Structure formats: C-alpha cells, structure tokens
Amino acid sequence: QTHIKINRGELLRGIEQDHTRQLPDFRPGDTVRVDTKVREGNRTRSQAFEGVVIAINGSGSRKSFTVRKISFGEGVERVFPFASPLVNQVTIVERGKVRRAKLYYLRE
Amino acid sequence: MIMPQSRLDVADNSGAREIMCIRVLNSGIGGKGLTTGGGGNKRYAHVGDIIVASVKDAAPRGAVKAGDVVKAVVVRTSHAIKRADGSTIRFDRNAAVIINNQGEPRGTRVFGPVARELRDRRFMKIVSLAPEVL
Amino acid sequence: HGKAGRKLNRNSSARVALARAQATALLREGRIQTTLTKAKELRPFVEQLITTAKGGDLHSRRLVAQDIHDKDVVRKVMDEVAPKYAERPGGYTRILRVGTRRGDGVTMALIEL
Amino acid sequence: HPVPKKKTSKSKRDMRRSHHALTAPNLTECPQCHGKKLSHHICPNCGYYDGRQVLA
Amino acid sequence: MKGILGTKIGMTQIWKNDRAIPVTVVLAGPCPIVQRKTAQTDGYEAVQIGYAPKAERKVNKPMQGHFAKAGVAPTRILREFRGFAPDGDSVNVDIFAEGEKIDATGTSKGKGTQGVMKRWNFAGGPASHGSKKWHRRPGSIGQRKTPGRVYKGKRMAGHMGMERVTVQNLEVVEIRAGENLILVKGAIPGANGGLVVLRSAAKAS
RNA sequence: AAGGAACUUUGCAAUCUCACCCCGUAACUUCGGAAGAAGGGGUCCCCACGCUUCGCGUGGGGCGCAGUGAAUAGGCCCAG
RNA sequence: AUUCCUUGUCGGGUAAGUUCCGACCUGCACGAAAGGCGUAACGAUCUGGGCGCUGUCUCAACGAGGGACUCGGUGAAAUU
RNA sequence: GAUGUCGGCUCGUCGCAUCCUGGGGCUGAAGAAGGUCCCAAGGGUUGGGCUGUUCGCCCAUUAAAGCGGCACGCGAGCUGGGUUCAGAACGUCGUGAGACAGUUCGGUCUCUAUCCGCUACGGGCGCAGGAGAAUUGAGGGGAGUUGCUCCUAGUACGAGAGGACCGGAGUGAACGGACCGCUGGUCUCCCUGCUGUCGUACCAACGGCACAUGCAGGGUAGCUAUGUCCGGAACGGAUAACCGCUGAAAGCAUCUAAGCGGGAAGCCAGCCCCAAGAUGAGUUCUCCCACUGAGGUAAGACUCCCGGAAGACCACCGGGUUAAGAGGCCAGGCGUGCACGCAUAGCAAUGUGUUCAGCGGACUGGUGCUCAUCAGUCGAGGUCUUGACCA
Ligand SMILES: CC[C@H]1OC(=O)[C@H](C)[C@@H](O[C@H]2C[C@@](C)(OC)[C@@H](O)[C@H](C)O2)[C@H](C)[C@@H](O[C@@H]2O[C@H](C)C[C@H](N(C)C)[C@H]2O)[C@](C)(O)C[C@@H](C)C(=O)[C@H](C)[C@@H](O)[C@]1(C)O
Ligand SMILES: [Mg+2]
Ligand SMILES: [Mg+2]
Ligand SMILES: [Mg+2]
Ligand SMILES: [Mg+2]
Ligand SMILES: [Mg+2]
Ligand SMILES: [Mg+2]
Ligand SMILES: [Mg+2]
Ligand SMILES: [Mg+2]
C-alpha cells in the first residue's frame, strides 16, 4: 500500500544470511546434536541429542529441523533452528532410507 | 497446558500412578516455603507450574494412596515448550512429581526426563532426582 | 478477509471438468465465445497447457493427455498447435468482449487462440 | 412474526425509491462502421475493434 | 517529536546475543521536507515529509506546484509530524538509535464485515443442545421496557480492522543506514508493502 | 494444537465402534440363555508345496503410514 | 413411581454427591389376584456409575458446499 | 378482541447501604495481622461437585470471590430442565365421575423487520469561484484491574517468637490491541500413496465415480491461539473524608468566620482512536483563470478496462502503451519426495540406475508475449454591505 518499486526477496534475504547457517546434509536418518548450554549458571554443559530426524521445515534464518529420541523409557522431540547460537555442530549417525519428507508415523 | 480434569503421570516413587488435576495455581516457590499464587484464574498449567490434584490410581504400598488430594509439580508437557534460543521440546506423555508444601518431592527418586525449565523455576532437588534434564 | 488465488462458481470437481472441457474446445475451434468471467478463468489454465505441450516429449504429451481427453485434440495441440508457437515468449490467448446477452443479461465474450 | 406497522405513505415510499434511477450507457460512435458502440468492446455493426473481429 | 515514514517489508528470525528475536523489517526511505508548519503563517508547529517516489507525469499540476515550492521531487505520500524541527531532509541516520523504544504506527489489515465473535469477542451459544443460534448471534441487545432502545455505542457486527493503530514501545534492534533499513522487535500493524510511521516513544519510563 | 464431559436438565448432539475368519469370553440363570459378554489376533501382492469347490492352509519373499486399503459396517460395561 | 417434616440418619462411590446403591426404622397416608415379595431373559422404557471416544466443552480456527450480497427475467405475503 | 410465566445461556448497563483495590480518623492500634467508622463506584470480583432451581452446602482457589435495579433486565436472542393442557402410574380423598399441599414417566417454542433505537457503509446537497493535497482540534469514544518476589531489612518496633511503613527494583495472572517470524492448527485438487469399477482399442500410462475432497499421507500463501509483540502507567492541576498554617468573634483556645497549604484506583488534563453536517461548516500549500450569446472549455475529475494484503454493493488503493497493472513466460523460492520412458536385476511381487528426479495454487524479482484499444461524460468566470490599505 506504499508504492515503491522494491524487491522484498533481496531486502529480507539481506539479513537472513548473517543469521543463516549451513549444516551437514541429512534428509533421513539418525543424528548427534551437540548443543552448548548455559542454563546451569556460569557452567556451560554440552548435551547430546541423538535422534531420528523427522522433519525438514523452513528455509532462510527460519529453516529448522526436528529430531526424536527416547530418553529413559519416554519419547521426546526437539526442534533446532539450523543457526541456533545454542548449537554446535550436528553429525550423521547413519543415513536412513525414507519415503516421504515427514515421518510422523514414527510416533505410533 | 494442563487443566482441571486433566490426567497427568507421576515422575516419582511416591506410590501414585495416575493423578487428575483439580486446580492450576500460581506456584510461588521461594523465600521460606512455596508462596500463594497470584490470581484465581490462570487457566493453564505449563511446565514448572504447580497444580493441585486428586490422586486417581495409585499402587499398593505407598506414601500416597488413592483419593489423596495433593499438590504436584509439572515435569512433562505434550504441549510444546519453547526456549529462548528458539528450540522447542515436547514429550509424548504428560507427567508430574508429587510434592510437599515446601516444594521438595514426596518420592525417593524421579522417573524419566524433566524439563530444564524446572531448574529455571528453582526446584532443586527435583532437578537432582532427574535421570536427564533436557 | 477472504484472500486466495483461485475463483470457483460451481463446486470443486465441476470447475475442473469444465475448465478441461473449455480448454478442449478452444483448442479444437481456435476461438469460442462464452461468458466473460468463464473466459477469464479459461485463459491462464489453457495457456499453461500450451506450454506443457511445447517441449514435445512423450512425457509432455501424456501430461496433456490428462486434461485433454480427445486424442485428436491433443494430437492437434501437440503436433500442430504447440510447435507453431515457438519464438512466442508464451501466452497466446487474447480476450475480446462482445456484449451483453438477452435471457440472463450477462455480458459475453470471445476467447481466441 | 415481524410485520410492518402502518402502510407507508406515497411520500416516504417514493423517497425510498429515490435511488433506483437508471444510468444510461455512455456511448461513442464507432470509427469504422459509423454506428454507436460501447467502450472496450466490439462495434456490433461492422465487427471492427482495432481492424476487424466478429462477422456481422 | 521525532519520526519518519517507511514501508513494512517483513517479519524475520534474528539473534542478538543468544536470544532469538522476531523482528519486523521496515524501510524508512529518505523523507523530503515539503513544508514547515510554523506559528506564523500556519499557526501550529509541524513539519511535512514525503515518502514514496512518484512518476512526474502522474503528478497533478497543483501538487507539482507544492513540491516545486520546496523543490524536492515527486512523492506518492505526504505526512505531518509534530514539534519536529528538522534540517535538510529526513533519514533514520542520526534519527533513531539502536535500542530506543519507538511508537510504531500503521493501518490494520482490514478484515471485512465480521461477526461479534471476531469483532467484539463475545461468546455465541451451544452448538450442542437444541440451539438455533450458534456462532455469533448475540443474545439481547437490551433490557425490556426501560429504556426500550439499545445503548448508543453498543457492540455488534461491522467493518472490522482497517483501523489506524499505533503500537507503543517497540524496541529498535538493528540499524543499517544507506540501506535505509530498520529492524523492530515484535509486530508492527498492517500488511506488507504497508505504510508505517516510526516515531519517538510517546510516554515511557 | 494441549486437554477430554471441565458442557449440560441429561454426553442432547457428534465421535469412537463396524465386515468375515481364528482364539478367547464373567456374575446370574427358568440350563435355552446371558453372548457378538468382555477382550486378543488375522486381512493386500508375488512364488513353491499341498488341499475337500469357488478357493484354502502351510512355508518363503515384496510393497505402503495404512492392506473388509474406497462404499455398505454393533462403542462397551457395573448397578438399579 | 406412595415420604409431609426432608438435602431423615449411618455408610458406598466423588477432591466435593439435594440424585443414585446399601442399611435403619418415626410407613405424614405400602401390604397380599384394584395382588404382596421375588425372578433369568427381554425393553428405540426410566434412573445412577464407569471404560472407551469425541468440538459437548475451556475457545474457538481454517476448509467446502447450499442461502444470504450484486446484474438481467418473472415477482408474492402476512400487516396497515 | 392476550402485557408469555420459573431457572439457565448470551449480551450488558446502572445505584452504593463498598467483597477487593485506593485515601483517611479512632482503637481494648508495639510490630505483624486486625476490629470498627469516614471518603471513594476507575477497574476487578476464579473453576468445579449436588439440585430445574435462584438461594444454599461442600472441593480447590483467591486481592476479592459485594448487594441490588433495569417488566424478580434479556423467548419477534437461544434453551424449555422447573409449573399451568390432552396419555399413564402411585400414595391419597370421593359411593361415582373425578380430585391434589402431592410425587412420578411423557409431551409442537410460529414464516420474509415497516418505523424508532443500534452496528456498519454509500448516494445528494450544504460549507459565496472551480479544483489537488496537507491539517487544527470544538467535541466524542476506548482505556483504567491485581498478586507474587527482591532490595530497602533481618532495619523501626518487639522479652521473645516474629517483623514493617516509606521509597526502588523485578516477575506473572487475567483482559485488550496488533501480528504470523517462531510453535502449531487448517489450507476441497499444490505434490504423493491406495482400493473397487468404468473408460481413453489392448499393454503401459492416465481420467472419471466412490462428498457436496472416494480414502490416506504431507502441505506454500492466506487466514488463525493455545503462538509472538506491545499495553494498564509517569507527570501536572482542581477535589473527597482527612490532616494542617495564619487568626478572630470569645485578652485563652480555635483548620474558618477574611484568607492560605497538603490530601485518594475517584475529577480534569495527560495515552490510543474518531472528529468541521463544530450549517457558529475553521487553517495552511498549490493549481486554472477573468470565456461565449444557459453553452464551449482551463485546472481537474468521472465513465470505461486491468487488477488489490480494499470490499456484500457502493466506497478505498494501483495500472491502463511518455506502460511492468494483472495473466502468461523465464529464473529462483517453496511444497511434495525420485516421475515417463528406457536399461538392468530377479520365475515373479517388487528392486536398482538414469533421477536432490518429475510435478506445481496463492511466494520473490525479471520479460512488452496477452488484455488494459478507442473514445465519450462532466467540471470555474466568482452575491452584497461596511471598515481598513494602494493607485
Ligand atoms: C408453528 C406455527 C404456529 O405457531 C405455533 O405453533 C406456536 C408454537 C404457538 O404456541 C404453542 C407453543 C407455546 C409454547 O407457545 C409458544 C404454547 O405456550 C402455546 C399455547 O402453544 C403459538 C405461538 C400460539 O400462540 C400463543 O398462544 C398462547 C395461548 C398465548 C400466547 N400469547 C401470550 C402471546 C401466544 O403466543 C398459538 C395459540 O398456537 C397461535 C395461534 C395464532 C395459531 O393458531 C397459529 C395459526 C399457530 O398455530 C402457528 C403460527 O401456525
Ligand atoms: Mg509445519
Ligand atoms: Mg487478505
Ligand atoms: Mg480474494
Ligand atoms: Mg466428487
Ligand atoms: Mg463456542
Ligand atoms: Mg423481547
Ligand atoms: Mg424513552
Ligand atoms: Mg456513544
């Protein structure tokens, strides 16, 4: 409703990148998420999440991904922003053969 | 997000299997005891929130039997829980720790992962009984 | 505040079988006249279909074979019509409004190839 | 239920009908067959819209 | 006092320190000063700035005259700010600083003619038991014989949204001048491409 | 979504349930019934062997989130 | 299905139960074919509880279709 | 010749004899917590079990779970549980028909708003020329709630146990506004998977029907809470009860009799939004000019066409070839998740390669391929009187 000639694609993308981060390529399969954590006070305790990746959602700074683990008898899911300063790298446990980009059936 | 009428699990050995909610409250732990919750509404119980609840099904032989009305702290919400880096956690089943009025748990240990937000909320011994703080 | 790309008039299945039939006919005759809006609907649906057709592979032809059910019609679009537009940046269909109608008072128009 | 209370007078009623006044087509003479046609459409007489279109 | 015009471009995910902050991207493009309102030949203290550039052909003879007076340029938009006494012309360079709270005003996305459900909240009634009134369908509009009437200023269906709306105390996160870009914590009102005005905090601590 | 009767005069309404095969099935009882009690499991495609007919069982293998793959299709129980 | 006093008194279930089940007896005004007390089965009967499951609900949202709106054609009504 | 009646649900609004919150006086007020009275109606006043119930009892809360009015507010707004129709039963009274201070199961809630009133939104005219745009606010509405914790401070007080005022920090609840980046919902044909049957001759590949999507699995834009962001205030002025300065009538005393100063969630102003039909119609900037004998026209609109995060229609915004408005096309995004064909592997079902493939609604730019062609309709010459200033 203001008429300026401008591309919102490049405008927006302008700061996406500085906040965007590239991860090892995984469509399927298990992954170790090594996550740096200061919520313990001064202490920073690296934590492990080793899950199946069930979701690929987003792109740009918003691109995120989802893993699912069972820790101590009960199921857990977690969603990591590909650039989350609270995150150090992710690596592949193994490569999965999967038929759809979703994998929600894993909950049943 | 728990409401009255909403059955949660028990993360302790307190002797109670399933409890049903009765009242969400505003849960003041600090100073000397727990404090008295600001507001008589507060419609939903999140993680690190205290509820009051009826004990619905409990095992034989416990510090807590069926029908015991008791306060509990909320350990695992299915309803998603967002952190300030932006990640989110959510567990498959709902669950909780039965406590006393000074906040300490009534069970001798705690079962399965608990939300890190519980340590945000200063529930120490519960975080200490925790197999994993996620 | 209803906001979307699509227009319908009848139901969900109808708007298909109709847009398919009208595409089929305009490609068959080369010009048809219909109510103005129905023509406005027809324009970009058939246009994209001209572009599936050019490129010329069996794949393309079997894509066309879904919307266009007359083998003669598809052979025409594929072999005759498609190639004919070549240096055409895309988009030959144009719309001409003829004028209002007697019975329902609806303004009508020709869409032509 | 809900019916009207009295008849409405001729005055108020036509006052209502104040707005139904018809807008007559704003026409223009066709540059080709010299008969009056309608803007952004074809002249029904020749068939000409920029050169020639329909056969009449 | 201070302020500028800009267009809403989008909302995005961003980190300053380790916290993840939703921002909204505005562009406050340079804003020419077309007229200064003064107590003398005007009578109240204001200033007038333009925003969206105009094709010179499309401009009115009169408005071309207006822009001529101050000799700026064509602009699709003119706006007055108050107690503002700038010099030269107006960009956010030196205007806003990172971390200032601002009053960021826009025009709401119009929602059509809505229920009281959307509009006024309300309640409506059981989809369950015997009801022929579901959804919006308010109950009474009033009492019975005293005043048999309905209150002036009652709440019922209507054109909802399209409201002029200022949002108070939004935090300015980042500033790139010369890209004429500005980032703001939280939501600004109205859709994208929308015209917004960023200005000084009205009242805050 | 999270919750699951907190709705309400009342679960009113609407789900859930659903076919056929196998297994399995309580108090009480006029020994007929209760009973489809309750529950549990199978279900598609290919190949070899066998069989009392359409087919069926056995073994092995393949695919999907799912195989009465869409339509027809019981929610149940305890007390009065 | 008779109970006035009445939410009778104990108990059962419920976190809490004017209803419901059980027990008492003071039966306002049960009672033996205008049948009394029982009974398996049956019941689109009525009453209370549980499981299951759900937009009944917290608290609503999005989607579809048919009206509602707009143009051309036909064009009523109760009321006054 | 009809004013529908209990209770609920929905929507409110009002009184103050105030349940909370705010300000005070007294106290059998050390502090803490109170009891009472005075001022105060801005806002707030929770969820459940039983009952048709309001009431009431209980569970778990809370700052508090206020009392009444509005035809015991509200059925042309909903319910229809309660009572006052017809059936049936019990107790009971009547010889009977029947009956009731009873109880029990059952039992039709009526189509299309004329006016006023109300929420939205246009049309006309007015506002001493015709116009484009920017505005002052007269006035008017919204809002207004509160706990908790920390510091103050283990201070004042207090034998102790305990434990502050005041001021200053945080942190929520519920409520409201906006918003869709995140988390998720849903996205009726955007991608895929599946069954029966029918069809395009057959195979292979596809299309219909199985909803008004045949079923399932995802799911972009849009829309959307449960999701996110912001809010309630600070300040100032004038007050309430109240507390005081100066001070007489009344050599003393006296807040009052002259006068003067403090004093509340209340009043005004401050915050957000509306607003000159504020017929007392306001102000500022620019444009066309001083035709013609009611008509041509200037400046400028409108009609029309193409579209929109604008919308029932109107209105509003943008484009309309000195053109990037929309479609298509190209590139990318994004969704889906590996096409057809072919080759190969197996007796086959299937598997593998080619193939991060194929496909494609709404996204982000680009491109003159398509339609915005052509034209028509309308739109000023400025009333008068006085006063000032110049020729
Ligand atoms: C379907 C459409 C029919 O309406 C109904 O069925 C509703 C549902 C009745 O109420 C039904 C149902 C109910 C509950 O009333 C709503 C009940 O109380 C009455 C006795 O019968 C109505 C309204 C009755 O009115 C009411 O009659 C009462 C005696 C007095 C009352 N008055 C105070 C205003 C008045 O409104 C009454 C007598 O039937 C109206 C007369 C004119 C009729 O004969 C007309 C032709 C109706 O049959 C009808 C319009 O065709
Ligand atoms: Mg998602
Ligand atoms: Mg929209
Ligand atoms: Mg639309
Ligand atoms: Mg169909
Ligand atoms: Mg509702
Ligand atoms: Mg009424
Ligand atoms: Mg009156
Ligand atoms: Mg008003």
Ligand SMILES: [Mg+2]
């Ligand atoms: Mg769920």
Ligand SMILES: [Mg+2]
């Ligand atoms: Mg209930």
Ligand SMILES: [Mg+2]
């Ligand atoms: Mg209730």
Ligand SMILES: [Mg+2]
């Ligand atoms: Mg039912």
Ligand SMILES: [Mg+2]
């Ligand atoms: Mg009892």
Ligand SMILES: [Mg+2]
């Ligand atoms: Mg029978």
Ligand SMILES: [Mg+2]
């Ligand atoms: Mg009443």
Ligand SMILES: [Mg+2]
């Ligand atoms: Mg009317």
Ligand SMILES: [Mg+2]
């Ligand atoms: Mg909210």
Ligand SMILES: [Mg+2]
């Ligand atoms: Mg988005």
Ligand SMILES: [Mg+2]
């Ligand atoms: Mg075939």
Ligand SMILES: [Mg+2]
């Ligand atoms: Mg059909």
Ligand SMILES: [Mg+2]
């Ligand atoms: Mg689907």
Ligand SMILES: [Mg+2]
């Ligand atoms: Mg082979």
Ligand SMILES: [Mg+2]
């Ligand atoms: Mg297609």
